[PDB]
Amino acid sequence: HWGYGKHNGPEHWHKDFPIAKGERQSPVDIDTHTAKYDPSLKPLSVSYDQATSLRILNNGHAFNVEFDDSQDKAVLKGGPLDGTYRLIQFHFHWGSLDGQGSEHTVDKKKYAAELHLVHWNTKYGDFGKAVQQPDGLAVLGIFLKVGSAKPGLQKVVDVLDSIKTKGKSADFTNFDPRGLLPESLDYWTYPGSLTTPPLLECVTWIVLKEPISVSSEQVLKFRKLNFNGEGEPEELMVDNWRPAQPLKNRQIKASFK
Ligand SMILES: CCOc1ccc2nc(S(N)(=O)=O)sc2c1
Ligand SMILES: [Zn+2]
């Protein structure tokens, strides 16, 4: 099965998922001098005050914090989007070293990790329908750099011991994702894809310009997770990022100049 190892990593994925070589794959390198300022772009509207987190899960390639998406509780609108997108989960990608880990890069610069808040377009009724549409998903991407600790992240860090191996889950209620946002909501946006299989080209990417800082101790605890299931040989969950893909016939737009 697919993963991030030498024998099943991103350069192998196209054999099972031919769309890996598609025309609107993610992630990409954001060239800040080629991105076009678009004054017609609206500010992002993040409404997370009623968010209901349920569970945190190690799924074998990352850990997901899952939300109740049966109503318009935590939604994303505005920006480049038409209509209302519901938050369903967030997860991270990170590296084995502080100098790598993000999926998107900015002028070829890598960050230590990247947070993805995944939302789906409510006009399609459920998430599985949404991923089959060109405007089905909106993923908010936030860069993590190593520096001062992020207080709002610590509740996530402290529960990781309980979901060390693949398939483990833990109740995770009353988590407020607003504690993970940067001060500014300026962004780049482009049409792209899921960055893990099935790599569907259904995503409007919204990548925030301002990174958040987390401490070395916080990111260190990410790196203690396991790709494997309990009772299997230990493989540390690190470097679960896909490298940048060709931009091809797309333009990256910026909400700011
Ligand atoms: C369709 C089964 O659920 C999936 C599969 C892949 C996938 N990739 C992302 S990401 N890394 O935010 O682009 S969210 C997501 C959800
Ligand atoms: Zn992701």
From Swiss-Prot:
Q: Where are the transmembrane segments?
A: none
This protein's cofactor list reads:
Zn(2+); Co(2+)
The effect annotated for residue 64 to H is: Enhanced proton transfer
Q: What is the effect of changing residue 62 to F?
A: Reduced activity
Outcome (variant: residue 103 to D): Normal CO(2) hydrase activity
Provide the species name: Homo sapiens
- What is the protein's given name? Carbonic anhydrase 2
What outcome follows a substitution of residue 59 to A? Reduced activity
Source gene?
CA2
